[PDB]
């Protein structure tokens, strides 16, 4: 059994003008409306030709208390980085929510540097902002027509990446452990 | 048993920076991943901190034939309007998919009149364009300062109509009988 | 020369980057504008600013509505023929059409041609579209999966949507007899 | 004399199925085509129905170097804040680029705390992250049925603020000096 909020999906079906009275086979009660499972919700999604994600579209509860939402050094999700064989990030989720899952904000040790090969990544759909909170970063990025890119980010210096641009943040110096963090969005 | 296409899911999962690995607890073949239900699917999204309907975007089969869809008159949902015991419209519907479930085409008969009470709707989030196939149609709505407006429309004229804008569509002879064509898109 | 902004617009700008009116100083303005010797010193402006020129107009073209509607009539506006290799293919008219929605592209068309004539596909376009067929029989083609050509009929009253980018051709099914639809771009 | 590209322009008419040829007294290069001035090139909107901005869209020089932007620490724009006799922060703009105008990233000094009289902003459209980078910080915001929340962020912490809701970053303890980092985005 399968609960669908009853406005949102008596919106749904007026999008096609039609009521709850023209859906087959449904109990509904004051606020909800009830499947028979997902094959039963899945077969009302093709009979209204609305993909089924638009059934759950804005239907997660908001996990913000009050317009905002907090987290704590240590308190989620964390991770090691390892490229071909080398340790490159540990990324250390900041705070993380379902009121904009585009939204990925990062804490990462860099532990590569200049003595191992570069790893740069594949690039990605989303814009990038990178501040350095410790250390000296150097940076390797694939340019305009293919060509390697390189710099050294200080301490309060910063970063926009464009989309798909492929990038490394490496150490400077090697054995010196930098901090950056690093906003993907949008 | 829910299974969600394991490329897409994957997808989901580099956002935020996991791989399958880090979901210990589901079975994979080489391409789909396995829920024990909905449930478990929600526990998944609540832990990523991604609302559920993101599993399903772009996951429902597509109903399209080679690119296009193609429906025809009389073809499928039909019904008749009455507002306030007055017979307005009879709702067409044209082609629809579900690859556009914002587009909601439709063909209509005009039944009302000025001998009959007006019956507006109260406006909608789509925006809309009407043009008249056939006939002569009196087209009210509500305007600035809510104030009513009213105008006439001839065969091959057409309107656009903003999002919310409340409006009704009649005859303008009374006992003639006009035709319409509306498309509700984005 | 002189190009004016909307000053509360503008202050919203500025407002983005943490500024005021105060940090551009070599700009006069009156209660609603702000106004630039020539586009140059816009565009200096907007370097300054690192906001790309646009910005400085979105928003800011009024409205072509009447009450929220627009209204347009039969031969009221632009109307063109469209002859692709030597072959007539359409006439073309615009219903309306709106700055409130500039990618709404509703067309009414009149088609010339049948397969007497060689075929003469478009390339596709971003805008998804719904065709509706008004008058006749009409025969429309398309490039399918695996770049296949497909084809089919519509009757009057029949419909048709296309996804962005696949290519298509509208004709007449019958050869001599001329044929009317319905086409809206969107989005 | 206004410029315009000349790709750009056809895709707009082409938007429009027009071509050159449908625009009145209009010279061109193989690249550019030029109005005498803007109420022309304003003029020539008005008749395709397309607002202004879209004339203009893409056609700023991208301030990247090989996709990538980098700013320095001091680099850039630097502002002290003071609200109503109150200094209450000192603005430093980080990495700042035309590719996305919407992207405002700082870095923060606090100079206030509860000693001083409250500065609550209004609230802004974008979405906000803050990240602390030093010393500890006590937020304040105004969140559900206009009642006044609190809490304080420790080196470390982070925060996700809703669009409009508005905000006051502050130092907890008091003639100590914090740092933050805000992204504001989207
Ligand atoms: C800091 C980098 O951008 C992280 P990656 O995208 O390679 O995970
Ligand atoms: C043609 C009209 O827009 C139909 P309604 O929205 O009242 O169903
Ligand atoms: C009816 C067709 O869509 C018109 P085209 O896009 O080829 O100009
Ligand atoms: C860090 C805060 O968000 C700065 P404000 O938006 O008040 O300028
Ligand atoms: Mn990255
Ligand atoms: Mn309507
Ligand atoms: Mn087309
Ligand atoms: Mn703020």
Same mark, same amino acid.
């Given at each position: 059994?399968?609960?669908?909020?009853?406005?949102?999906?008596?919106?749904?079906?007026?999008?096609?003008?039609?009521?709850?009275?023209?859906?087959?086979?449904?109990?509904?009660?004051?606020?909800?409306?009830?499947?028979?499972?997902?094959?039963?919700?899945?077969?009302?999604?093709?009979?209204?030709?609305?993909?089924?994600?638009?059934?759950?579209?804005?239907?997660?509860?908001?996990?913000?208390? #009050?317009?905002?939402?907090?987290? *704590?050094? @240590? +308190? %989620?999700?964390?991770?090691? $980085? /390892?490229?071909?064989?080398?340790?490159?990030?540990?990324?250390?989720?900041?705070?993380?929510?379902?009121?904009?899952?585009?939204?990925?904000?990062?804490?990462?040790?860099?532990?590569? #540097?200049?003595?191992?090969?570069? *790893?740069? @990544? +594949? %690039?990605?759909?989303?814009? $990038? /902002?990178?501040?350095?909170?410790?250390?000296?970063?150097?940076?390797?990025?694939?340019?305009?027509?293919?060509?390697?890119?390189?710099?050294?980010?200080?301490?309060?210096?910063?970063?926009?990446?464009?989309?798909?641009?492929?990038?490394?943040?490496?150490?400077?110096?090697?054995?010196?452990?930098?901090?950056?963090?690093?906003?993907?969005?949008?």
């Amino acid at each position: 059994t399968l609960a669908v909020g009853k406005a949102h999906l008596e919106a749904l079906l007026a999008t096609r003008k039609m009521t709850l009275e023209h859906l087959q086979d449904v109990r509904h009660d004051a606020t909800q409306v009830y499947f028979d499972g997902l094959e039963h919700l899945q077969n009302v999604a093709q009979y209204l030709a609305i993909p089924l994600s638009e059934f759950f579209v804005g239907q997660t509860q908001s996990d913000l208390d #009050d317009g905002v939402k907090i987290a *704590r050094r @240590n +308190g %989620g999700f964390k991770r090691e $980085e /390892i490229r071909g064989g080398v340790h490159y990030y540990t990324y250390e989720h900041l705070v993380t929510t379902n009121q904009d899952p585009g939204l990925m904000a990062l804490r990462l040790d860099l532990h590569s #540097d200049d003595e191992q090969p570069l *790893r740069l @990544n +594949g %690039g990605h759909g989303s814009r $990038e /902002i990178v501040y350095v909170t410790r250390g000296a970063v150097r940076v390797r990025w694939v340019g305009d027509n293919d060509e390697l890119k390189e710099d050294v980010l200080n301490e309060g210096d910063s970063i926009f990446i464009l989309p798909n641009v492929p990038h490394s943040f490496t150490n400077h110096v090697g054995g010196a452990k930098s901090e950056i963090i690093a906003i993907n969005y949008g």
